[PDB]
Write a protein that binds this ligand. Structure first.
Ligand SMILES: Nc1ncnc2c1ncn2[C@@H]1O[C@H](COP(=O)(O)OP(=O)(O)OP(=O)(O)O)[C@@H](O)[C@H]1O
Ligand SMILES: Nc1ncnc2c1ncn2[C@@H]1O[C@H](COP(=O)(O)OP(=O)(O)OP(=O)(O)O)[C@@H](O)[C@H]1O
Lengths: 868, 503, 132
């Protein structure tokens, strides 16, 4: 009949899914190790392409099946279109099945090679010995740290990105005269990624005993005992463990190092931060070479003892600055430049293709070094790490945005008690721990705020993702390479663009297999009105639309045909309402709009999007009515909703909060007077009482945009506030400091932020106690002039800042006695505040000089040169 | 309808491209190493031929699809011709697909052999020791360069084309009395293309210590330390690193050579110019034997201590001048001539087929030596190097013309920020760095202007391209061989001609 | 290391013990009856099926995979429980590797399973919100 077609193509769908299970298992097995056989790599590419096309067809089938339920809404016209679409996906599934059958029939040999898989020398690294550049201060610091410490065995770890020069520094320390005199016994051990403990112990024994054939039947435990005897009979010993990769390796090798109270030391180099953290609470992070040091190293490597020719100085320096201070990159470039003609033209050519040289000329040198860390990544983390290469090199990627993108792209599959955001944060922490991602900024609470990949790893990610994995492709112009044609655009899965977006869209590209458009450019671009429908028309299967840097003036109807869309980022200066047709995108997870208008109206039923997770805006959003007809009488709950960033005060009813039991972050902007005003009924509990019903709420932000505060406001009692609230932000709300005491009764409060005169009043004295877990306090642009506290008022305060608060007179001296205080910021303050800060510093110096343990307190005043 | 045929043949085109991806991967894997099995080589030739025909058919299909847009310009007459052409390429694609299917069905065994590929002794080279010809001045120059220098470890590299005689000069220096007196310690190390650092260090230790079984559990780092101790306890030391192939080998081996301010020296022979440039800013380029020296070497190799017969002097000299001063070519010719009858007729016959002798009589001697450098070429550079054999031997090929030809023939595939000309120039620089191509003239700005291949490598390129790869074929007359017929001309992909073009 | 040394017929019996909530005390009589009902105990000798299941439980206890919390005055096992960490291992093996049984719960973002995966569930373990 009419509906027989859906079942007929579904019959093929289960068989396609059965084949996909085998192909995904084949892909995972092939990805377990790096295949060098060309036929195997070609087969893997073919399997991955047919798999990705299969997911695209299955996703289209799922959308068609979901939309089939709306036949009654449009009658015959929709029936005809649905029949044509169902036939279209039917022949797409058939074509995929033919390709799968062809792969099974013809490519059986590679399938055998992976399934059975019937099919090395340990290469100790060689490093610079004499001309080590820029490591004088680092070596001196580590040597001084080796000398001083406890009498037990202590480990000094050196951590960093691959190729940073950890082994070069370790060998420089190993040959340093001061430790050649201090440490009578010096042992170098190469603890490779793979190693044998028996071989390690016999190697250590060989340093002392020439005859080692008598240990043929000696167990490894007795070998460790013999190593302990050999090392302990002398004085101090320094042992260098090179390239330790796992915690188990250190735990299993350290049994051979005796404890004698002789201040024995172990210097360990590692790429893993967690291993370093376990072995020492303060791992030594190896520094990057400065631009001058990078040029000096390149000059020494290329021209030996001689200076650079004057004509090659400027191009060479430009090359060194493009190496980003990584000694391995500088060495590779020097090897490439030595084979050149020592002319300005060729050096400039190298400067324009630094990455290509660093990767493709000699993959045996550096590409293998990076692959050592990359191949140890878990299979689910490889895609996440390669995603980081989409953003331009050197750009700072927000952790929140990267986490949301990972969740939207489906990389994060998880079913336990933790949220998807927590799992993605754990993935980011794992990447950072392996030193594959560098954290550039952290929040005051310890979270990662922005992170970036080093330029050389970014080049490696671009290489792997574009030429090997076909994960994403980049579009650009300027040189002979133009915008891609339809033939290769038909095979592109994700599209990264940075500039000339309207020019690219004017060509009406084909994006039938494109599932991600990432506008990674920083410049805000006003899209022409005639080019607005270009994005949905070009890419019907768009799953991720990161158009945050693109300003849209209107919503075209084709935007509502993106039923696979999960991530939205849009900027706008004209949009005031969200059309109801936007609710047809039932797969939306993250909805971000950045509108300059005062108010925004959510006419679309976001409650229908059961998979919705974030609604992040900057203007006051009016949520749609929760009243639903009898056709949808069931009490659907948006349990996956985590963020309601800028909802209206009048929409803060108990109705919306019932539908959002797991809301973590909440924010309100507008007439907050309506939030605090009691209802006309007898009970005085207003709409703010509904906020306290959110058990999982942790973040609250209130923005009072109106200045008609003729009636003073009162904070509700503390028990009305959420019990598990951990962070509160207030700005331009015009409260009074007498209400701070209410906030002091919050048991779980940790971070409090007041901006643009959140509280009003000159002075206010708090009693002892309160704020049990508060750690971060931020004040900016306030009228406060006096503030009295006590030592017990802030037991756990760590951060304290006043910005442009010249009206403040002094601070309590009890703050100087706070054990957990680490940093205070004073900006554009009066000279009296500066003198009080100097007195606090002098008191801290005297207390440290009294003989007790150093507190480690630090104080900063900016600008430093003011008051001179 | 009328346009249904284009889509129908395009449906076969995607399947043909899918098969071509597998076949190209198979060809790349087979080209990774030199197969000796005859069935495997025949299958590789069959796959390559069917691949090349497939590209020809696909190119014709692309041209037909592009020209289909001009139907309105010539109406029915062009429509009829386009239909006939579309049918013609349709049956060509069908025939290619049948051949691909036949290869898959019948030749599965060789495909297994390449895909799984389940299936040596280091041969230290032997060189002339007593009758070294023409290297007196070169040896004296290198010896004087070894004596003078800084107090640190300095490397004197000897570079040249394969078979030039770098090891012969190195051994002559190694046995020279002046350095046997100047350098108390002399060590010869054969750093082959493949080597083990532990074996190298143990070999060096064996020069000084007879008992080496106590280093069973000693790490390679401590072995290098022991080598440093053994070498440093004496005076100056000279160490000969023979046939160093890569920069990593020198970086990884030099850790065992101590610095004492005693003017220690390392004499290294290499075929790579970049390795020599890194180890010393002024590498010593080994000279070619002159025509008189080539004849003298040939006379010594063939007639031992005796002079050549007067009747064989003129033919022999003509042979030596055809060896182009390469000692390896002279040695191979001498081996071939010793088995001859020492008559003018046979020597003249050898003079007319010098290249054939230098390649085919004893492939075990020289063809393997050239294949050592050739097989290390990247897969995309092998076709570019073999192209250089199209031009006549001894001719000077302009670099600009060669670069343009490489780009036109589609050898240069590149997508980065550099231009195609820059990539082709980098390919030419890589070929020159491996001493497979000799630069004869450079522009004042440093660019390569004209380059030529040595005659013996040119013969090797002709051998590989005509009989193994079928890259190009040469057309000539004058001897019993006439212009090719239709049967073999139907299989020729590129045509090189030099004379009698109108005929 | 201990799990792989289990006999093939004891692996299913041990993984069954993970169905009950962690830290709960499982009656030996109830566990034996459940094992017999689920067909794990196949036996044809002179002993009863209850005796064979009791022997299986004794074997599990002997390997210290199951802890006996109470014994009858006659020496029989009355209640036994698995340590929480082995219970987590049993949950891991049974849900993600063997598909022996699946657990249904709510409270966090994970809701009741849909028809697609419920169609593949062989055994259903539930603890709360049964009427819902
Ligand atoms: N300060 C330096 N001056 C000159 N060259 C350096 C310096 N630091 C490192 N290098 C060079 O950089 C390359 C890599 O450095 P190194 O061997 O120390 O790596 P690493 O940080 O230990 O990395 P891995 O984790 O891969 O072992 C080597 O070729 C080394 O010579
Ligand atoms: N001056 C010479 N007089 C006589 N024979 C020579 C001379 N130079 C080289 N030969 C001969 O040429 C052949 C190759 O020379 P040689 O072994 O020195 O090669 P090479 O330049 O070191 O090359 P490779 O890079 O292949 O090791 C040998 O058989 C050697 O005897």
């Amino acid at each position: 009949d009419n509906a027989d077609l859906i079942l007929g193509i579904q019959g093929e769908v289960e068989n396609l899914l059965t084949d996909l299970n085998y192909f995904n298992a084949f892909l995972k097995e092939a990805a377990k190790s790096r295949r060098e056989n060309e036929v195997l790599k070609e087969l893997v590419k073919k399997i991955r392409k047919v798999v990705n096309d299969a997911e695209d067809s299955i996703d289209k089938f799922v959308v068609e099946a979901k939309r089939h339920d709306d036949k009654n809404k449009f009658a015959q016209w929709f029936h005809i279109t649905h029949v044509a679409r169902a036939k279209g996906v039917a022949d797409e599934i058939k074509s995929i099945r033919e390709r799968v059958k062809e792969i099974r029939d013809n490519d059986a040999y590679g399938l055998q090679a992976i399934t059975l898989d019937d099919n090395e020398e340990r290469k100790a690294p060689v490093v610079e010995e004499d001309d080590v550049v820029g490591f004088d201060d680092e070596a001196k610091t580590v040597i001084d740290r080796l000398i001083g410490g406890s009498d037990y065995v202590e480990v000094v770890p050196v951590v960093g990105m691959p190729g940073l020069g950890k082994t070069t520094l370790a060998y420089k320390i190993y040959k340093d005269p001061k430790v050649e005199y201090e440490f009578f016994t010096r042992v170098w051990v190469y603890v490779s990624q793979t190693f044998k403990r028996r071989e390690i112990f016999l190697n250590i024994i060989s340093k002392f005993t020439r005859n080692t054939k008598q240990y043929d039947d000696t167990p490894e435990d007795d070998l460790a005992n013999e190593v302990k005897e050999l090392l302990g009979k002398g004085g101090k010993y320094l042992i260098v463990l090179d390239d330790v990769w796992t915690m188990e390796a250190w735990d299993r090798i350290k049994i051979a190092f005796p404890n004698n109270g002789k201040r024995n030391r172990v210097l360990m180099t590692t790429r893993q931060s967690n291993v370093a953290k376990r072995c020492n609470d303060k791992p030594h992070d190896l520094k990057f070479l400065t631009k001058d040091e990078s040029w000096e190293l390149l000059e020494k490597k290329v021209f030996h003892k001689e200076k650079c020719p004057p004509e090659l100085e400027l191009p060479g320096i430009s090359i060194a600055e493009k190496c980003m201070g990584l000694p391995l990159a500088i060495v590779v470039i020097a090897g490439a430049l030595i084979g050149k003609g020592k002319t300005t033209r060729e050096w400039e050519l190298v400067a324009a293709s630094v990455g290509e040289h660093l990767i493709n000329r000699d993959p045996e040198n550096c590409k293998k070094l990076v692959q050592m860390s990359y191949d140890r990544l878990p299979y689910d983390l490889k895609a996440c790490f390669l995603y980081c290469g989409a953003f331009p090199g050197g750009s700072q990627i927000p952790a929140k945005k990267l986490i949301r993108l990972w969740i939207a792209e489906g990389f994060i599959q998880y079913q336990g008690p933790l949220a998807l955001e927590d799992v993605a944060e754990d993935h980011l922490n794992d990447l950072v721990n392996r030193n594959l991602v560098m954290v550039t900024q952290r929040s005051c609470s310890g979270q990662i705020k922005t992170c970036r990949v080093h330029d050389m790893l970014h080049e490696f990610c671009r290489h792997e993702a574009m030429m090997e994995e076909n994960l994403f492709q980049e579009i650009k112009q300027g040189q002979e390479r133009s915008f891609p044609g339809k033939q290769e655009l038909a095979t592109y899965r994700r599209l990264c663009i940075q500039s000339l977006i309207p020019e690219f869209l004017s060509m009406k590209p084909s994006g039938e297999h494109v599932r991600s458009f990432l506008c990674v450019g920083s410049k805000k671009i006003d899209m022409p009105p005639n080019e607005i429908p270009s994005i949905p028309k070009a890419f019907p299967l768009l799953r991720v639309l990161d158009a945050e840097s693109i300003k849209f003036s209107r919503f075209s109807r084709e935007f509502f045909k993106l039923f696979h869309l999960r991530y939205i980022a849009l900027s706008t200066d004209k949009i005031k309402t969200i059309p109801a047709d936007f609710g047809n995108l039932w797969n939306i997870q993250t909805l971000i709009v950045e509108t300059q208008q005062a108010t925004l109206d959510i006419k679309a039923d976001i409650w229908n999007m059961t998979r919705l997770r974030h609604v992040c805006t900057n203007a006051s959003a009016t949520l749609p009515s929760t009243k639903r007809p009898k056709s949808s009488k069931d009490n659907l709950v948006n349990r996956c909703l985590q963020t309601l960033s800028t909802i209206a005060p009048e929409c803060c009813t108990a109705e919306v909060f019932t539908r959002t039991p797991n809301l973590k972050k909440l924010g309100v902007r507008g007439k907050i007077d309506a939030l605090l005003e009691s209802s006309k009924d007898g009970s005085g509990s207003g709409l703010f009482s509904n906020i306290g019903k959110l058990g999982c709420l942790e973040y609250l932000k209130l923005v009072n945009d109106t200045r008609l505060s003729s009636k003073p406001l009162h904070l509700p009692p503390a028990y009305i506030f959420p019990q598990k609230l951990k962070k509160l932000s207030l700005v331009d709300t015009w409260f009074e400091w007498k209400d701070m005491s209410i906030l002091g009764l919050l048991p779980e409060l940790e971070v409090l932020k007041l901006k643009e005169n959140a509280f009003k009043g000159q002075s206010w004295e708090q009693e002892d106690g309160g704020f049990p877990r508060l750690q971060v306090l931020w004040i900016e642009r306030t009228d406060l002039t006096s503030w009295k506290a006590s030592s017990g008022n802030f037991p756990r305060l760590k951060h304290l800042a006043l910005i442009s608060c010249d009206k403040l007179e002094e601070l309590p001296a009890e703050l100087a006695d706070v054990k957990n205080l680490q940093l205070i910021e004073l900006q554009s303050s009066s000279e009296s505040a500066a003198r009080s800060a100097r007195a606090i510093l002098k008191r801290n110096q005297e207390k440290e000089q009294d003989g007790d343990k150093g507190t480690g307190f630090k104080l900063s005043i900016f600008p430093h040169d003011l008051g001179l």
